[PDB]
Amino acid sequence: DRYAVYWNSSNPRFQRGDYHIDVCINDYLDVFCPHYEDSVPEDKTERYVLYMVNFDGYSACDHTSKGFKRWECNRPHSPNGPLKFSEKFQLFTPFSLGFEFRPGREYFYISSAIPDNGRRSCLKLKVFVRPTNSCM
């Protein structure tokens, strides 16, 4: 039911580039920011700003006039382990800005480094919502 994704370059799934997840209606997605110990001098530390882009923004790694700002991995030294961000794959959202999800469609996510990549290659995640026939 719940899907856990650790957002870091050290992860073997992200290194492939073709990292995709098959999700159903009313399912959850948990994104974990890269957590580092107090001994780290914050130089090797990774910090990313997440964006929800389209198919054009997925291949070109651009978020300007193509996507919207989602979450930010600003402080790596969080008290209760890594920073956790929740995303529900609901059909209808009660919140005014809250993102909706449709069955049998693809949704894309990208991340840009704060210090940087130089528009060469970005850490990307492909999200596909399975139709009503596939989900029970």
């Binding site: 209808f92 959202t93 919140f95 809250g98």
Partner: protein, 507 residues
């Protein structure tokens, strides 16, 4: 942001809100979405519009009263239009119920679903999000509900969903407060509002440390959170001015003796400046003020001795005469004290004071009259009297340095009449005069008096000149007129006699 004290807030929470939801799964969810700028909030959402029957509960944590009467709840929520979303009518709703329960237990494990007290079924006023499909815009509807009076230690809040698509953004729990203000020189503290919106609280505030309550100071605490028009005024204490809303001290060179509405007055003339917050400006060395005298009055000097003294003797009695003193100092109350010395008899300064019962007809001491008379004295004895000029302040001031005195003898006779008179220089404007000392002086000669009256004409005013010397002149006299003169000898003993009536006509 407002003056109202907050109890519970979605922004102020340490990490997670941690609210009990019944049912847990398929009920209220803690779906958190960040609000601009850099503010993390725990947002509660529920959208079960599809399922036919719907019942939902969301109980908040323990909310302490902290001595509050009425609590105001501000709820920020987003809705969805039932016609804009696909499905059957009625299954979807646009209203939600609000509940509250009073308790004394700090950490209650479970609160009954039936024990809750309903407040009102809330709907998004004025406008509600459908939400618009083309462009996405945030809602601006915030609903406020009041709850009171409260008897128990604290309370718990609950939310009920009847099949609506609702998103609770922020829950503000506050209680309306009256501010700490210092009005009419009296301090008033922060006070809680009444049990109702119509209720008012009478606040009787204490006055400032350097002040005294003339009238009982009181105000009324309005339910809105504002103070009302004051009743009763307070005035700052003596030596403290009523300036800046708080009791201030009088500046260096200023004083205040009585608790009046007026400010600190400047030091009076010849008064030394005291330190900050003075009751009365102290008198500098050489100047003083009486105990029964007013504080506003300037520092007064002691009086000088009366410059002229005239003495006349009788068979058993004596008479003394004197004028007003030179320097009064300021005080109008001037009295004269007559002191008997008895130092006249004998050459040395060492003497015995007048122990015998000496009687005085006007007054013994403190005489307001310019003339004194001593009824009884001993014959053949030499006496000496001191006329002391006494002021109202002279007691408080150091004893006067000097006092005009005269040595007189009781038995000795008054000087006799002058033998002869002669005019040495006679002119059309001036007439000179010369005379001999009397044959029998009976004491040292001190003064001579010459009379000036018109002869062969109407009775004019006889002018008397005072000269220590035996030679005198006249300035300003009419020509071809007859004048008569009389010389009189004056000693310490007393009044003499008139001379040879010398008829002298102008040249």
């Amino acid at each position: 942001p407002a003056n109202e004290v907050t109890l519970l807030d979605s922004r102020s929470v340490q990490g997670e809100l941690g609210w009990i939801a019944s049912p847990l799964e398929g009920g209220w969810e803690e779906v958190s979405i960040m609000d601009e700028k850099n503010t993390p909030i725990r947002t509660y959402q529920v959208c079960n519009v599809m399922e036919p029957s719907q019942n939902n509960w969301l109980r908040t944590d323990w909310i302490t009263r902290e001595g509050a009467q009425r609590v105001y709840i501000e709820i920020k929520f987003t809705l969805r239009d039932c016609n804009s979303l696909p499905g059957v009518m009625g299954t979807c709703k646009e209203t939600f119920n609000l509940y509250y329960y009073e308790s004394d237990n700090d950490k209650e494990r479970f609160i009954r679903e039936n024990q809750f007290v309903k407040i009102d079924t809330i709907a998004a006023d004025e406008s509600f999000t459908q939400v618009d499909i083309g462009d996405r815009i945030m809602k601006l509807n915030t609903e406020i509900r009041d709850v009171g009076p409260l008897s128990k230690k604290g309370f718990y809040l609950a939310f009920q969903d009847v099949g609506a698509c609702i998103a609770l953004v922020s829950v503000r729990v506050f209680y309306k407060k009256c501010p700490l203000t210092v009005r009419n020189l009296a301090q008033f503290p922060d006070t809680i509002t009444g049990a109702d919106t119509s209720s008012l609280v009478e606040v009787r505030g204490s006055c400032v440390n350097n002040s005294e309550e003339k009238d009982v100071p009181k105000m009324y605490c309005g339910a809105d959170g504002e103070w009302l028009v004051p009743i009763g005024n307070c005035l700052c204490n003596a030596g403290h001015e009523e300036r800046s809303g708080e009791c201030q001290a009088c500046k260096i060179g200023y004083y205040k003796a009585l608790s009046t509405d007026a400010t600190c007055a400047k030091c009076p003339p010849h008064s030394y400046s005291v330190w900050e917050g003075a009751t009365s400006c102290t008198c500098d060395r050489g100047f003083f003020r009486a105990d029964n005298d007013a504080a506003s009055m300037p520092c007064t000097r002691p009086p000088s001795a009366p410059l002229n003294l005239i003495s006349n003797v009788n068979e058993t009695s004596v008479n003394l005469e004197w004028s007003s003193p030179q320097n009064t100092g300021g005080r109008q109350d001037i009295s004269y004290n007559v002191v008997c010395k008895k130092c006249g008899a004998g050459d040395p300064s060492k003497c015995r004071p007048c122990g015998s019962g000496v009687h005085y007809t006007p007054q013994q001491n403190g005489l307001k009259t310019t003339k004194v008379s001593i009824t009884d004295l001993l014959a053949h004895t030499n006496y000496t009297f001191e006329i002391w000029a006494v002021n109202g302040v002279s007691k408080y001031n150091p004893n006067p340095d000097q006092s005009v005195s005269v040595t007189v003898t009781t038995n000795q006779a008054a000087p006799s009449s002058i033998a002869l008179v002669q005019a040495k220089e006679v002119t059309r404007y001036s007439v000179a005069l010369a005379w001999l000392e009397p044959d029998r002086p009976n004491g040292v000669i001190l003064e001579y008096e010459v009379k000036y009256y018109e002869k062969d004409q109407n009775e004019r005013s006889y002018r008397i000149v005072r000269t220590a010397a035996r030679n005198t002149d006249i300035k300003g006299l009419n020509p071809l007129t007859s004048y008569v003169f009389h010389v009189r000898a004056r000693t310490a003993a007393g009044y003499g006699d008139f001379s040879e009536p010398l008829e002298v006509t102008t040249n």
